[PDB]
Amino acid sequence: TCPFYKKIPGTGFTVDAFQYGVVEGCTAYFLTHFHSDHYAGLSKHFTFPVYCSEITGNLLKNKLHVQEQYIHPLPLDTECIVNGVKVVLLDANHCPGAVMILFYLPNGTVILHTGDFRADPSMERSLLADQKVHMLYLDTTYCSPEYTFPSQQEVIRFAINTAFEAVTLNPHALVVCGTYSIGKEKVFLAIADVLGSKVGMSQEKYKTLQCLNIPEINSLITTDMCSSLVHLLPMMQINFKGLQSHLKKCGGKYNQILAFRPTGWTHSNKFTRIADVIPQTKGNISIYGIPYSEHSSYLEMKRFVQWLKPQKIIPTVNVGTWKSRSTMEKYFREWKLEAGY
């Protein structure tokens, strides 16, 4: 049964609730972004409206095969009416096409659902600046002071230099980058751009990236593995046996792989900086774990909510245990007392 934190009161709307059947009294189904936990349940056989970004729209049509008429895309930053409710979609700074949703209820209540987001100061100068928000439905994935991690530009720098070094020392070396969803494209794009290559990948992953309205994207990727020296692979495969395997496949064209695992948080963030990272090494293969997050750090979260000063916060992540819920209420209370809202 759809949980209360996927429902929008005084509307027929649900958010990221595709996996319970027909939720009785749901006229519309909003989807924040294309990652499987949020879209779970969708197929070609859905015949209720869906609301979403143009990009998330392109992915539903071409990857899951949802019928044209049921995908309602919306422009961002645009006051839009949807069953006589003003809504606005805002960039969530998560994976491509990912949105936060502003709901303007008839009664005068204003509600922000963040989906999955990485909060940024840029968001304080958007349409949220104009007016008050009474309820915040919040991605609490890293709501605990232990969770720090570096910025996206710090991480990308590291990655660029590392690869550009190795390939300049040994030109017969191969870069590989792991991936299992959309998101974190910048890793493999920024590397490939410093190396003067296109990114090689499967057919499936090319079809996926072709949906994302990236500029000059035809010039940046290929389905030809032979003619490229930055390859993508399923994250499952990014290990010693599975790389060696793949290193056999390329046919005596490279002698050394230098791979990247873009992780989120890991426990070594508590005891090591970005400039001081090292790889595991079984011969000619070197694997780098790098903490590139598309979710908010504890502090980024904190600042956003302290600026927004919402009247009520409702967690959408790590809600499934009482200890996690209870912990999170402490931090919401600390934030509000500190800031005087």
Which residues lie near Ni ion (CB under 5 A)? Answer: 35, 116
| Beta-ladder partners of 136 | 112, 313
CB 35, min distance to Ni ion, A: 4
What percent of the residues of the chain are helix, what percent strand, and what percent coil, each to the nearest 5?
35, 20, 45
| DSSP string across 210-265 | HTS--TTHHHHEES-STT-SEEEEEGGG-SHHHHHHHHHHT-SS-SEEEEEEEES-
Kindly tell me which of 15 and 258 has the beta carbon lying closer to Ni ion.
15
Distance CA 92, CA 114 (A): 7
Q: Whose Cβ is closer to Ni ion: residue 51's or residue 254's?
A: 51
Instruction: Judge whether 94 and 114 are in contact, CB under 8 Å.
Output: no
Residue nearest to Ni ion (CB): 116
**Closest separation between CB of residue 293 and Ni ion, Å?**
11
Sequence-distant (≥ 6) Cβ neighbours of residue 315 within 8 angstroms: 5, 138, 140, 143, 325, 328
Q: Beta 135-138 vs 80-81: how paired, if at all? A: unpaired
Nearer to Ni ion, 184 or 231 (CB): 184
CA pair distance 302, 135, nearest whole angstrom: 16
Nearer to Ni ion, 205 or 231 (CB): 205
**Paired tokens of 319:** 């809600």
- Residue 35 or 246 having the CB closest to Ni ion: 35
Nearer to Ni ion, 116 or 300 (CB): 116
User: Both tokens of residue 197?
Assistant: 């290559």
CB of 89 to Ni ion, least distance (A): 16
What is the nearest approach in angstroms of Ni ion to the Cβ of residue 256?
A: 34
Between residues 286 and 316, which has the closer beta carbon with respect to Ni ion?
316
Min dist CB 40 to Ni ion, Å, is 12
User: How far apart are the C-alpha atoms of 85 and 50, rounded to whole Å?
Assistant: 15
Tell me how far, at minimum, the Cβ of 140 lies from Ni ion, in Å: 13
Give the nearest distance from C-beta 316 to Ni ion in angstroms. Answer: 11
Q: Which is nearer to Ni ion, 14 or 32 (CB)?
A: 32
Smallest distance from Ni ion to CB 182, Å: 9
Nearest to 125 by CA among 196, 70, 77: 77
Contacting residues for 40 by C-beta, under 8 A, at least 6 apart: 18, 19
Residue 100: count of CB within 10 angstroms of its CB: 26
Whichever of 116 and 185 has its CB closer to Ni ion, that residue is 116
Strand partners, 259: 176, 287
Residue appearing with tokens 């000063």? 309
Least Å distance, CB 194 to Ni ion, is: 27
